[PDB]
Amino acid sequence: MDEFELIKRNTSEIISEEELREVLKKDEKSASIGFEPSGKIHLGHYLQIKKMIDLQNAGFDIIIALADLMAYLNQKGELDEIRKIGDYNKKVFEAMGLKAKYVYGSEFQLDKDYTLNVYRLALKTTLKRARRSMELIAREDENPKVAEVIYPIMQVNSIHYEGVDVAVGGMEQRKIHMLARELLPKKVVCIHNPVLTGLDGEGKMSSSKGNFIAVDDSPEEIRAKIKKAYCPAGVVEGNPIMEIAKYFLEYPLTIKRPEKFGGDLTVNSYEELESLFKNKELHPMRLKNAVAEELIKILEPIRKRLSAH
Amino acid sequence: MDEFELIKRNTSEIISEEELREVLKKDEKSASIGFEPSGKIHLGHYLQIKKMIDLQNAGFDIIIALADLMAYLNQKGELDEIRKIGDYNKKVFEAMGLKAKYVYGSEFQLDKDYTLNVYRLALKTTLKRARRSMELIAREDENPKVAEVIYPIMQVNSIHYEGVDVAVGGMEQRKIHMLARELLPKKVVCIHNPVLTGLDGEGKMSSSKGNFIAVDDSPEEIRAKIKKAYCPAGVVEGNPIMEIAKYFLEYPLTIKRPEKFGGDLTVNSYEELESLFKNKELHPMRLKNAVAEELIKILEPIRKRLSAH
Ligand SMILES: Nc1ncnc2c1ncn2[C@@H]1O[C@H](COP(=O)(O)O)[C@@H](O)[C@H]1O
Ligand SMILES: Nc1ncnc2c1ncn2[C@@H]1O[C@H](COP(=O)(O)O)[C@@H](O)[C@H]1O
Ligand SMILES: N[C@@H](Cc1ccc(B(O)O)cc1)C(=O)O
Ligand SMILES: N[C@@H](Cc1ccc(B(O)O)cc1)C(=O)O
Ligand SMILES: [Cl-]
Ligand SMILES: [Cl-]
Ligand SMILES: [Cl-]
Ligand SMILES: [Cl-]
Ligand SMILES: [Cl-]
Structure with missing residues (x-):
């Protein structure tokens, strides 16, 4: 198959296929996906890494975000613990045959000009759109916290700072991805994999x-x-x-x-x-x-x- | 009058009077109030500065927060412009006879460990309590933004970082003040002045x-x-x-x-x-x-x- 086909294989959607074709023309291009660090890396994760390997084989530089600060905002525990799980996740990904740049969110998501951009984004993002974007991602909570609406802006801002042409994840990420396409100057091409x-x-x-x-x-x-x-x-x-x-x-x-x-x-x-x-x-x-x-x-x-x- | 009386004069409420009495015993104590920078400093502002002068005369060290970043989150314009209005406000306050420490929010509200605390707070603060706290402060908006619920956490965190024993403002600040009393390890004594x-x-x-x-x-x-x-x-x-x-x-x-x-x-x-x-x-x-x-x-x-x- 050609590059487009190899990328499209086993995906649920590509927003949009015409934009992907534009990106493919570039001499340099990049793609990212994030993982809230997880004590087990299962086949659902593996399906996503297989797509990252396809992108890599199509000449993309791959960034894997070890989303320690985002996991923290989504109630996964204390940052030190989440990072230790992060380290283990990195090793699993490496064991799958992915060659990538691995970045911990906390390496940049607390910098002054990143934070200032979070707040710029917050001025543009409605509470309603932010809550709706988290419906398939937020940890269940009867008394929803402010952290929940910070989370999707941090994902959008991280896409921005990563510089990537393409963002990848499961179908549940699609609303955060649409927000990213609306909030940032460069529209990211979004590739969604099926949920196992x-x-x-x-x-x-x-x-x-x-x-x-x-x-x-x-x-x-x-x-x-x-x-x-x-x-x-x-x-x-x-x-x-x-x-x-x-x-x-x-x-x-x-x-x-x-x-x-x-x-x-x-x-x-x-x-x-x-x-x-x-x-x-x-x-x-x-x-x-x-x-x-x-x-x-x-x-x-x-x-x-x-x-x- | 004694110190307590001088402080209490012309106030609407003190949360609480017993706690104020404890604070007065200390050899060192401090008080703050913030202003979203304002193109005119009017009598309502002057009433608050008069209370800060009373506190100062009762042996408090006074911090005046020139709340440039908070004004930005509450849709008062671009940060550079807000700061220029900030500079003018500082001069007016000085012209009123206040001797104080004047601090721009942006001097510390973008530091890494301040930001990390914002996010810790966000995990503790419900969306409902944050929105309700802004009912008398948020700029009118038919499509309320995430920025609105970041604002009260930034005020709470700033109270924390300022180290103050007392926080002062108009009655409309009371819900943000109650949040501060619930979210921080040291309960701040809150003094509310009437709204002119x-x-x-x-x-x-x-x-x-x-x-x-x-x-x-x-x-x-x-x-x-x-x-x-x-x-x-x-x-x-x-x-x-x-x-x-x-x-x-x-x-x-x-x-x-x-x-x-x-x-x-x-x-x-x-x-x-x-x-x-x-x-x-x-x-x-x-x-x-x-x-x-x-x-x-x-x-x-x-x-x-x-x-x-
Ligand atoms: N069951 C699954 N099937 C497919 N992808 C998944 C599955 N579980 C998690 N992922 C993906 O792995 C990334 C990290 O998700 P999570 O472990 O839920 O933080 C996201 O893009 C998810 O969509
Ligand atoms: N009309 C007013 N009467 C009393 N205090 C006021 C008035 N307007 C503003 N302030 C106080 O000045 C501080 C800054 O408020 P603002 O100018 O609305 O950012 C707050 O503590 C307000 O309560
Ligand atoms: N929301 C994703 C996590 C995530 C995705 C992307 C990034 B990034 O820095 O591009 C970070 C976290 C999840 O549900 O686990
Ligand atoms: N919410 C206040 C502004 C404000 C108050 C206190 C602080 B602080 O750093 O203690 C900052 C801003 C207002 O309505 O204008
Ligand atoms: Cl809301
Ligand atoms: Cl069947
Ligand atoms: Cl059989
Ligand atoms: Cl009358
Ligand atoms: Cl008369």
């Missing part, structure tokens, strides 16, 4: 016990977690095992089976896996066994690289 | 054409403005001419009158002026003439001191 379902089949993959696969999980945890996952016979939509198969597995792959149960299956693609599953030619237990074993192998270089440090 | 009615008799004295007496107004403007002021025969409540007579004039004073209109009046106090006015022994035109002429004299040292620079 959790193992439980109750909403997005998150740190909830048994609800995520961490990229550094042991083989026995990957098996245990996949075995327990929501995965009804025939059902592809909202089936996290099928989503894993779509976004992470390599094809062709073969699934191992005695004759009386149909015999072996050579699976040329995800689309073949889908039609086999939807037609009930392939059952949940065998699908889960395949996916776990294939995932273990896919993730092995990340585990090994981490263990070796 | 404008000349128009429509709400508070402000910069509105003809609505204020500036402390540096010429004699002919003071006369013209007083002559036009709302001042109905008999009516003391909401009568700005009577408020001026109460808070600024020196007693005893004599009012000049031909025999057929009652003859001269020696006025021992404001309370005598009040009973004469309420009983219609003294008419609006004569009251206005007296007040203007007495005000001109009271303000003359401020004008002279300013003109002499």
Whole structure:
């Protein structure tokens, strides 16, 4: 595929595709994404880093924001603790094969002229738009705090200071991204990746016990977690095992089976896996066994690289 | 009078009087008030500086915050312009006989550890309490901005950084002051001065054409403005001419009158002026003439001191 195609693959939306095409013409271009530091880096995070690797392979310089100050404003704990989790996150990302510039928010988000810009932005940003932009991001709170409306302005200002042409994240970031397109002189091209379902089949993959696969999980945890996952016979939509198969597995792959149960299956693609599953030619237990074993192998270089440090 | 009494004179409230008494015991104590820089410094401002002078005479060190960054967050214009008005305000205050430390907000309100505290505060401050605290301060806006809820936290944080035992302002500051008492480790004693009615008799004295007496107004403007002021025969409540007579004039004073209109009046106090006015022994035109002429004299040292620079 060409650069545009490689970038577009497996995305949910690009705001806008015409602007992306303009950016691609440039000799130098850059892209960022932020992570509120997370004690587990799971497949949802990995999907985003895979997109950053695609951008890098399309000649973008990559900035990964370790968003320690933003995590602090979104009630993730004390800054010193969040930074220590930040350090671990950086190492995981590095273990995934990303070559990037890694920046801690607090290295610049407290500088005098950054802060002055936060306040300039605050004069332009309505409380209503700021609250609405956080509906899929703010930590639940019955008595919403001022911090909640500072957060999206800090993300916008950080996009500005990073200098990037493209900003990347999950679909839930789209309202903060629209704010950035309205508030800054240079309109950032925004690339949104799909949100991966959790193992439980109750909403997005998150740190909830048994609800995520961490990229550094042991083989026995990957098996245990996949075995327990929501995965009804025939059902592809909202089936996290099928989503894993779509976004992470390599094809062709073969699934191992005695004759009386149909015999072996050579699976040329995800689309073949889908039609086999939807037609009930392939059952949940065998699908889960395949996916776990294939995932273990896919993730092995990340585990090994981490263990070796 | 004793120190407590001198401080309490002409105040609307002291939160709390018991805490003020504790503060008075200290060998070193300090008090602040802020001003969003204002193109005119009027009698309402002068009433507050008179209270700061009382505190100073009671052995407080006085800090006057020239609140350039706060004015910026409350839509008073560009920072460079606001600072130039700030410089002029400082000179007026000095011309009133106040000896103080004058500090521009922007000298410290953009420092890294100040900013970090703003964000700590923001985590503790509800959007609802922040908006409610600004009901009598925020510039009118149909689409309220994030800046509005940053403002009261910056005032609270500035009280903290100033180190003061006492914070002073008009009654409208009381909700921001209550927030400061809840958010900071040391509870500041808060002294609220009454809000002076404008000349128009429509709400508070402000910069509105003809609505204020500036402390540096010429004699002919003071006369013209007083002559036009709302001042109905008999009516003391909401009568700005009577408020001026109460808070600024020196007693005893004599009012000049031909025999057929009652003859001269020696006025021992404001309370005598009040009973004469309420009983219609003294008419609006004569009251206005007296007040203007007495005000001109009271303000003359401020004008002279300013003109002499
Ligand atoms: N379940 C998920 N699926 C896809 N992306 C995700 C998922 N969870 C987190 N991310 C992305 O990782 C970045 C950091 O999100 P968070 O861990 O929620 O701070 C954001 O762009 C998210 O959209
Ligand atoms: N009409 C007024 N009467 C009494 N104090 C006032 C008046 N106008 C402003 N001030 C005080 O001066 C300080 C600065 O207010 P402002 O000029 O509104 O920023 C505040 O403590 C106000 O309460
Ligand atoms: N709001 C993102 C976090 C984030 C995104 C970008 C940046 B940045 O500096 O470009 C920072 C934080 C999240 O939900 O985790
Ligand atoms: N809110 C006040 C302004 C103000 C008060 C105090 C301070 B301070 O630094 O203590 C600053 C501004 C006003 O309405 O004008
Ligand atoms: Cl709000
Ligand atoms: Cl389905
Ligand atoms: Cl099967
Ligand atoms: Cl009355
Ligand atoms: Cl008379």
